[model samples]
Every structure is written in structure tokens, then in C-alpha cells.
Target: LPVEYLQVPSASMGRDIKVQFQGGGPHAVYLLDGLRAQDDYNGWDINTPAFEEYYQSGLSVIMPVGGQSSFYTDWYQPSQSNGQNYTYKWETFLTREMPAWLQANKGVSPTGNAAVGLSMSGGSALILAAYYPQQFPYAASLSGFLNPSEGWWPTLIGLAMNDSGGYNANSMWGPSSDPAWKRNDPMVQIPRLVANNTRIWVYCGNGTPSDNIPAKFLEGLTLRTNQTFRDTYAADGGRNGVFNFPPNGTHSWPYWNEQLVAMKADIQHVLNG
Candidate 1:
């Protein structure tokens, strides 16, 4: 299958967003990038062949690039330090604009799709599914920071944002008291996700150095949050989720790719069934 580059116009963002797309099946799987996402191509394509693998499985794959530390959310303000001129309306672009364009041009349905993201965008996948249940019936997060509103998570996220793209944490959802913070928190959205009966998949690696040292530390930290996510979902009576806590792995591309490959059957059943 050939890849198609689309410059979908976004009224919310006031610009055309570039998307790497592959059209084949009626339902599409959206692959979101991580914190240090590049402008040229999505990390899924750059780091692994996951998107191509999904395309070969008779599924359309949509990957949007250049959202470093954006969290795939609609920001309240631009990054002053980075001199970002346009408002980041990624939530609107993804849930509305891109879907409409895919339906009109590529014959892909607007609803009944799946979203899988890794690292920074991992929890964002669940947030998307929780908010737009009709659009995403299936969602997965690999090595994701699930409970961002808990403990020192917000401070950690603030540091990560500044290091990634000179972005401000306050500009994302405003102060820590803002509703958007809790609204976007995966732990907070567990009840809604459970109520919607969304098919969920959460994968996290132990702090083992299977891939890299950084991945080991990162996954080690994320593993705790993912555990809390699992406990919270269970407490909320969410039985549709598959939680994988491998004994040895890391927050790296190889492990993420393996998880994507392993979820092929689940994706097919949810999207094609």
C-alpha cells in the first residue's frame, strides 16, 4: 500500500495540518506521536514499521506529526517561549476536521475507529476515547503516563514540556486548578470510559534495561502510574480493558512496536467486527 500525505485544513488551528495516511479498510486507527515528535514524520513510522503493519492487516492508519509536548489537546494559549503563533487546536482537528476529510476523500468512516499512542500521547488516546466514544471504540496506550494529575506528575510534565519544545505547562490547561487538567487525566476519565464500554488496552514495561537506560527509567516511573490506572479502572467496574504489565521491558520503540503487533487481533475484532 502506498502512503498518502494530506494537508488537511483546520479552522480551529488556523492552518493546514499534515497527516500521513494509508487508506484501505473502512475503519481507521489513529497513531499519535510522543513528546519529542518531529515535524517531518511521525515517530511510529520513523522508529518502527507499526503503521505499515497495521495497513497490511486491512486497516487504515492515520498518523499526525509535529505535536511535540502538545499532548494532542487543544491548548488554551500559545507557547510564549517558543514563539508559537497559532493556537494548538489538535483535539478539534483530530476529532472533527480530519475525520470529515477522511470520510470525504478516502472513504474512511468517521466513527467506530481505534486510537493507539505511546509515551506522551499514550494517555491522550484514552482521553480521546473517553470524550468521543462514538469515534473511538478501541484505544491503547503503550508506556503511557496515565495519571498526570496525581502527586508530582504535573511538575514532571511541566519539566518535560519545557525540555521538549520550550512549551509552558500553564499554557496547556492553565493552572493546576483548571478543569482541563482533571478532564484530560486518564484516571479521572476511567469512569466515562467504563460507562461507554470502550475497549481499552494498557501496556507498561518494568524498569528493566531491555532496550535502553532512559527507557528503563521512564518505563519504571510510568509503570507505577499505569498500575494506578488499572486499579482505578477496576474500582470503576471497567472490565473491557486489557492491562499488560510485562516483567522486563522499557519505554522504547521496539517494545512499543511489539505491543502494537500483539494487539492486531484486538484491533481487528473491535474495528472490523
Candidate 2:
């Protein structure tokens, strides 16, 4: 495994993003971090055996560092919430800057890549693929909130952001009426994915906790969200979306790790393409 930092001048913080690399190929498969993503390293690399699984796959595994509550979307304004202050331009950073850097610095291609994420980034994976279909042909979401603008979702998301990193969702795409909500929502972006022939894999588990204690309520919420996405995908005549509904699971890393293993075939196919 090789880890590197890529400087992103677009981010107002002037941060050098930590990227963990595994395997080797021209086609990169980006693994995004979760809501509490750290600035130093990706949570997936820390919590899961992702590197071990993909290290010999011959597919470039690229995991960019940090996001916290940014949701990997370009914010309408910089966050000024209490002690937190930073500008988020992740959409541009990942789709444009990172790819260009990879192609120029490394031997990776700028297109036909794959992306996968858990929790916050599970939604982000779809957003990236839907918005930049030419770049990512495959996307997967595990225990993610697919629709963030529906019902009390916006408020819930704000609460979660505050809890995770004292961040403000208002700064991230403005008020409730902001079009950024619909623009970044995975449910809303499904049509773009369908139009682009992007393959998608969605996974969620009911609140049937096997061991993870805090996952009861969270998994239930995630289940409903993923179910809505699954239903919508079917109703829209979507053939590219694959839904995995496990009987017992949670919103924790263990299940996500298992999903990464189970989804390897399709992922390998996309990477080989």
C-alpha cells in the first residue's frame, strides 16, 4: 500500500488531501470516506480491511482524505459555524482536480473509473457517478441516505452534521429551498445515472442488530432510505441498479466490509472495463 497527499488549491483551507493507494492500474476506483471522515486518513482505511481486499486486484484503489460533514458536495458558502470554518469544493476536487492529478502524476486514466462509499459517501458515490458519468461508470452505496431533502431529512442531516463535526448544512448548499439539495441527492440524480448507463449497487440492512449496539435506530433509518431508493429504481424501469437487502445488519463498518467483499464481482467487472 502506498499513501500520498495531493494539494487542492480549490479548497479554501489550502489542505493537502491524504490519498491511500492500493493495487495498480490505469483505471482508478475511488473509495470515499464517511460523515466523520478525518483530514488525515480515510475512515475506510482505518476501520475496514479495504486495502487488504483490493491490494492485488490490479485496480487502482484511490481513497481521498476528509470531508467530515461536507457530504462531498460543493457548498454554497463557507462554514462559519462556531469554531468550524472551511470552504468545501469537494465536487470539483474529486471530479476534476484529483483525476487530472492522477493522470498527470500517476498513470491513471481520467475516465471510466468506479466509486464506492459508506454512510454519507454512499450517497456521494452516486452523486459523483450521476454528475460525472464520463468519469465514473460504476457506483455503490452502503447504508446511505439516498434522499436528503425529503420530509425531515434536511433537519436530520443538519443535526447529524452538528453532532459529528459542529458543521452547518446551511453553508452546504444554502437553505431548504436551495436547488443543491435536489442536485446532490442520489434519488434525484438516478435519472442522470440511467441516462449515462452507469451501473449502481445499493445495500441496506434492517435494524436487526446482531452485535453492533448503536446501530438499531440508525440502521432502521438507513433501511427506509435505501428501500425508497430501491423502489424508485424499480419503478423507473432502471436495469442498472442492484439492491441488496440483508436480513440482519446495521449501519456499522462490519456490514459495509462484508458488502465490499460481496460486491467484488461487479466491481471487478467495472474496474476491468
Candidate 3:
């Protein structure tokens, strides 16, 4: 289980992004994370338990080291963190650049595989799968925060943007007077997801929010998020996107680890497809 530090070029971020990876190529699974899970080596090395052993099961895990608030989307325009003008290029890099780079540099094949993530990244996995259907035939998300729009979790967004007090969801998307909110909403992009034939796996909680319960859940999936509606939307892929609800679970590592064992079959089923 060797993890490599990578400085790959990202046209979207406008600079080379730092990422962490394991296993050899030909089959890859792009793993993403939630906010605050910044990794020193990449993937869930920081905030979550390491599942790098899965690589031995045959997967080249492509985990971006840091992004903070990166929803894995190329922003409409850069604000102050204008590292790159187009994050959309990430899709290009993974689908075209990175795969080719792997094939050439590591003598590894870059075809036949999947992607996985949690929290904000759950949505990211979905988006990537929709756009990169051929790239990742299997994509799974745990404790994913699915919404009809980007405004789904205003509390988290506000805390991240306005120091928790000056929070404003309207500004995060657009003016309290604009429709930019609609544009950033993934739930609105259901049609694209449905048409792509992308395999998606989703999970969430309906209990008291982690912040409110403190000792209960952690950041990420909370009571405010919609796990069911998002599942129905991805239902266009029929069994592609699988959703889950656990009675004793929260939004933290406890629930995540539990779900990991439960969802193994779904992921395997997709890989077999």
C-alpha cells in the first residue's frame, strides 16, 4: 500500500493540484471527501479511517489531497481563491489527462473502474459519474449530502463563508435577489444523471443533526439534508444509486464505517456490471 504525492495539472484550478494515491493503474476509483477532511497523504487519511486495503482488491485510488470547499465543480467564475478559472478541466484531466499520464508513466492501464466519496463529495461522486460515465462505471457515496440545490445546507455554507455568524446562503449562490442558486443545485440536474446510465450509491441520516446532538453525529449529513428525494432522482439509473437510513447512525465516522460494510455488495455489483 504505497501512497504517492502527486502534483497534477488542473486547468480548472489553474494550477497543479496536490493528490494522494495508492495501488497500480488500469482500474481506478476517484475518492473524494467532505469539508475539513484535508489529507496529508490524500484520500481519507486525515479525518477518516484508512481503507487503502481495498486497493489490493484491485483499484487505483485517485484521491485529491486538499480542496476545502471544492464541490468538485468548476466554479462559474473565480472569486478570491481564483487558483484556476475552470475546474471543469478536472473532468478532462481524469478522463483524458490523468488516465493517459498513468498509462504512460506507470505502465498502468486507465480503463475499467469506479469512484467513491462521502459528504459533500457524495454529491461530487454523483456529478463525476454523470459526466464521466465511461470513466467510472461504478460510483458510490456514503452519508452523502444530496439536495435539490446548493442552498440545501445553509448552516454549513454560512459557517464556512461568513465565520458562522455573517452566513448568507443567498450570497454563496448569488444575490438574495438572483437565481444563481438554481444553477448550482445538483438535484436540478437529475435529467443528466438519469440519462448517463451512471451507477450511483447514496446514504444519509434523518436523526438529530450532528451539530445539535454534539456527541451524536459529526459534520456532513444532518437532519436537514434530503436522502430520499435525492435517491428517487438518481432512480433514473434505477439500481445505480442506492440509498440507506440507519436508526442508530449519525453523520460521523461511526455511521460511515458501519455503512462501508453494508454497501460493499452494491459496489461489487456495479463493478461486475
Task: State model 1's lDDT.
Answer: 0.87
Query: Candidates' TM-scores?
Result: 0.94, 0.91, 0.74
Model 1 residue runs over 4 Å out of place are 208-221
Evaluate residue 166 in candidate 3 and report its C-alpha lDDT on the 0 to 100 scale: 30
lDDT by residue for model 2 (111-148), tens: 88888988888889999998888889899888777898
Go through the candidates in order and give each one's C-alpha lDDT.
0.87, 0.79, 0.58
Clash pairs (backbone) in predicted model 2: none
> Which of candidates 1 and 3 reaches a greater lDDT?
1
TM-score of 2: 0.91
Q: What TM-score would candidate 3 get against the native?
A: 0.74
Better of 1 and 3 by TM-score: 1
What residue runs in model 3 are displaced by over 4 Å at the alpha carbon?
A: 37-39, 81-97, 107-111, 148-158, 161-184, 206-231, 234-237
Ranking by lDDT: 1, 2, 3
Question: Lowest summed-lDDT stretch of 10 residues in model 2?
Answer: 207-216
Residue 190 lDDT (model 2): 72
- Summarize candidate 1's per-residue lDDT along 1-273 as a digit string, tens digits: 589888989999888888999877889889999889998899998999876687677789999978789999999999888999988889998899999998998789999999999888999999999999999999999877788887767877888889887889899988878898999999988999999999999988766421122655655566667777899899999999998877776678998999999999999988887
**All candidates in order of TM-score, best leading:** 1, 2, 3
- Per-residue CA lDDT of candidate 3, range 1-273, in tens? 587877776654566777676765456667776655453654466645555545565546677766555555544444334333333334456667666766777755565567677766676676667666676677676666555255435455534534322323343354523454444444655566677766666667645442233523433345445654565574655544666666666667666656655655565556644
